Amino acid sequence: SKFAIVFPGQGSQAVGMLADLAEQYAVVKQTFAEASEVLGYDLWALVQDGPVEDLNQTFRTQPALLAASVAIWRVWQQLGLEQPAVLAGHSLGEYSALVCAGVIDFKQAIKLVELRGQLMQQAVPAGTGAMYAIIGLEDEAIAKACADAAQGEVVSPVNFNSPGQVVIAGQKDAVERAGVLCKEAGAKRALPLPVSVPSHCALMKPAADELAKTLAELEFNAPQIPVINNVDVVAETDPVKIKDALIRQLYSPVRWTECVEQMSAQGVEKLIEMGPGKVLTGLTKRIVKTLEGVAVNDVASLDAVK
Amino acid sequence: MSKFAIVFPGQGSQAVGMLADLAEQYAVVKQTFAEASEVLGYDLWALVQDGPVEDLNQTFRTQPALLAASVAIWRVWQQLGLEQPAVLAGHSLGEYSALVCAGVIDFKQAIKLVELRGQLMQQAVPAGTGAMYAIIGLEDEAIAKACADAAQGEVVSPVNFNSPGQVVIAGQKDAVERAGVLCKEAGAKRALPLPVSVPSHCALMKPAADELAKTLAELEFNAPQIPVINNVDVVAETDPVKIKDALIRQLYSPVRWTECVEQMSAQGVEKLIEMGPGKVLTGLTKRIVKTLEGVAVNDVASLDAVK
Ligand SMILES: CCCCOC(C)=O
Numbered sequence: 077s078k079f080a081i082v083f084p085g086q087g088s089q090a091v092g093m094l095a096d097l098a099e100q101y102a103v104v105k106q107t108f109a110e111a112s113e114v115l116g117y118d119l120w121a122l123v124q125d126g127p128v129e130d131l132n133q134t135f136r137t138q139p140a141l142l143a144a145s146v147a148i149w150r151v152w153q154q155l156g157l158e159q160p161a162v163l164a165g166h167s168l169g170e171y172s173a174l175v176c177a178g179v180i181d182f183k184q185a186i187k188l189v190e191l192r193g194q195l196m197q198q199a200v201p202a203g204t205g206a207m208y209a210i211i212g213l214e215d216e217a218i219a220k221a222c223a224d225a226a227q228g229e230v231v232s233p234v235n236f237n238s239p240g241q242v243v244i245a246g247q248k249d250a251v252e253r254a255g256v257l258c259k260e261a262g263a264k265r266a267l268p269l270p271v272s273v274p275s276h277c278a279l280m281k282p283a284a285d286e287l288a289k290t291l292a293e294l295e296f297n298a299p300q301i302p303v304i305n306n307v308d309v310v311a312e313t314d315p316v317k318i319k320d321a322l323i324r325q326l327y328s329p330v331r332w333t334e335c336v337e338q339m340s341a342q343g344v345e346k347l348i349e350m351g352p353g354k355v356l357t358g359l360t361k362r363i364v365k366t367l368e369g370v371a372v373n374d375v376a377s378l379d380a381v382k
Numbered sequence: 383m384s385k386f387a388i389v390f391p392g393q394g395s396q397a398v399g400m401l402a403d404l405a406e407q408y409a410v411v412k413q414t415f416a417e418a419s420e421v422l423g424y425d426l427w428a429l430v431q432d433g434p435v436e437d438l439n440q441t442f443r444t445q446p447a448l449l450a451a452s453v454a455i456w457r458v459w460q461q462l463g464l465e466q467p468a469v470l471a472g473h474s475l476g477e478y479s480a481l482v483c484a485g486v487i488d489f490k491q492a493i494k495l496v497e498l499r500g501q502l503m504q505q506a507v508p509a510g511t512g513a514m515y516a517i518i519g520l521e522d523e524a525i526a527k528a529c530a531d532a533a534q535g536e537v538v539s540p541v542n543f544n545s546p547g548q549v550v551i552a553g554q555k556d557a558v559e560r561a562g563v564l565c566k567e568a569g570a571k572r573a574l575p576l577p578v579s580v581p582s583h584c585a586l587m588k589p590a591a592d593e594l595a596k597t598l599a600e601l602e603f604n605a606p607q608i609p610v611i612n613n614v615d616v617v618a619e620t621d622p623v624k625i626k627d628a629l630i631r632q633l634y635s636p637v638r639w640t641e642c643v644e645q646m647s648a649q650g651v652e653k654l655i656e657m658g659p660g661k662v663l664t665g666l667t668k669r670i671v672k673t674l675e676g677v678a679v680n681d682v683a684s685l686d687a688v689k
Pocket residue numbers: 463464465466
C-alpha cells in the first residue's frame with residue numbers, strides 16, 4: 077500500500093463529532109455502545125451533547141477519541157477499502173492504532189485509556205507542572221535551552237510535531253526558565269499552554285510504573301498491520317515490547333516528525349487522519365513537503381477518499 | 383420555519399480544519415477570512431486550516447477566528463436567501479458575532495476589536511494567579527454562597543450561568559480552589575478545574591475592561607437590524623452607546639446564558655439555531671428548555687435544514 081493511517085490525540089475532540097457518519101453507518105453507535113458498557117456511562121451522549129468541560133477531562137477524552145477512531149476504522153473495514161501500509165498515532169492515538177492493528181481488545185483498550193488519563197491527572201500536584209510550545213527554533217537549540225534551564229529539575233522536549241513546532245514540559249519554573257532561554261536563542265514564539273499535566277517527561281515516570289501494572293493484566297497480540305511507536309519510531313512486533321513502548325511513551329517524548337518521516341522513507345505517499353479534526357493533517361505536509369494528507373471523519377471526507 | 387433565534391459560540395468551539403467543506407463551495411467564506419486577515423496582518427484562514435493549534439488556541443487568535451467563522455456562515459445563509467431570525471445572542475465572544483450579523487459593528491472593525499479584547503484579557507493578571515472551575519449539580523444561590531465562603535478577602539465569583547446546574551466560577555487561584563471544595567461539600571456532583579490561565583468574567587477584568595472602553599470609543603456602532611440579547615443584563619438593547627457599555631461590563635461580569643435562552647423563549651422563539659463551528663450551544667439549549675433545541679448550521683449539508 078502507498079498510504080498510511082494516523083490517529084489523533086488529546087485536543088482533537090469536539091462536541092458533535094461523528095454525527096454525520098453515525099447517521100449512515102450503524103457500526104459507529106455500536107462502537108460507542110461497547111465503550112459505554114465498560115465505562116458505565118453513555119459515551120455517545122457525552123460526545124454529542126457535552127458538557128464539554130467533562131469531555132475535555134483527559135480520563136474521558138481518551139476513551140472518547142479511541143472510540144471515535146475505532147468507529148471510523150470499522151466503517152473503513154465494512155466497506156472493504158484497501159488496507160493501509162502502516163499505522164501510527166499521536167500519544168493517545170497510538171492506542172487507537174494498536175486496537176485497529178488487532179493488538180489490544182477494544183473494550184479492554186477503553187478501560188486502559190480511561191485509567192491512563194486518571195493516572196496522568198493524578199501524577200503531579202496541579203500547578204507544579206507546565207507545558208510550552210516553542211515555535212521557530214531548531215531541535216538542537218531547544219534541547220540546549222532545556223539542559224541549561226533544568227538546574228536539577230525536569231524540563232525536556234516532549235513533542236517533536238513538525239520542523240519548528242516543538243512542545244517542552246516539566247516542572248513549572250524550569251519550563252518557564254527554558255522559555256526565556258528559547259526566546260534568547262531566537263525562537264519566534266514561546267507559548268505557555270493551558271495544562272496541568274506535564275505529559276511525556278520524567279515527571280510521569282511514577283504514573284508509568286503504575287500503568288505497567290495494569291498492562292501486565294491485559295493480553296496483547298502481534299500487530300496485524302505495522303504500528304510505528306512514538307517513543308522509538310519502531311514498528312515493534314513483540315507484544316511485551318509493545319507494552320514496554322507504551323510504558324516508556326508516557327514519560328518520553330513523542331517523536332512525531334520522525335514517525336511521519338519513517339512512513340515516507342518506506343514509500344507511503346499519503347497520510348489519512350482517522351479521527352475528529354485535522355490537527356495531524358496540518359503537520360503532515362510540514363514534515364515531508366511531498367506527502368499528501370487528508371482527514372476522514374464524516375460522510376463527505378469518507379466519500380472523497382474511497 | 384417556526385419563529386427562531388440564531389446563537390453564536392465562543393472560546394472552545396474552534397477546531398483546526400473548521401469550515402473547510404463550506405469554503406470549498408461558497409466563495410464568501412474565504413472572502414470573509416481574507417477581510418479578517420487584512421486587519422490582523424497574518425493569514426487567518428491558513429491558521430484555522432493548518433494550525434499550529436497552539437497558536438489558534440491563544441485567545442487573541444481564537445476570538446477573531448471564531449468571529450470570522452460565524453460571520454462567514456451568516457453570509458452564506460444570506461446568499462442562499464435563508465429566513466431572518468427573530469433575535470440573536472452569543473456566548474461571550476459570540477456576542478460580538480451577533481452584533482456584526484445584526485449590523486451593529488463593521489466586520490473588519492470587530493475583528494480588530496476582538497483581537498484586542500483577547501490581548502487585554504491575557505494581560506489582565508499574571509499567569510498563575512487566576513483559576514476557573516466548572517461546577518455541576520448546584521443551584522446558582524448555593525454557588526454564590528460557596529464563593530463568598532471561599533473569598534477570604536479575594537475575588538471569586540460565578541462567571542458563567544450556562545444551564546440550571548452548570549455554572550463556571552473564576553477569580554484568584556487559591557480562592558477558586560477553596561470554592562471548588564466548598565461546592566463539593568454543598569452537594570455539587572462535580573467540581574472540575576479548567577486548564578485556563580485567564581479568570582474571565584469576574585472583577586479581576588475591570589482594569590482590562592477600562593482599557594477596552596478606550597477602543598470602543600473609536601468604533602462606530604449602529605442600531606441593530608435584528609434584536610440582540612446581551613449577556614451582562616439579558617436585555618435587547620437598541621442604543622448603540624448602551625451596547626458598547628454592555629460589552630465593557632460584560633468583560634468583568636457573569637455571562638447569563640441560561641437567562642438569555644429563557645428570554646428568547648419569552649419573545650416567542652421556538653427554536654435556537656447554533657451558527658458556528660461545533661455543537662456546544664446546541665447541548666446547552668437542551669438543558670435549559672428542551673423544546674428550543676434547533677438544528678445546528680456549519681457545513682454544507684446542514685444548510686439544507688434551514689432552507
Ligand atoms: C425564503 C426565506 C427568506 C424570507 O425572508 C425572511 C424570513 O425575512
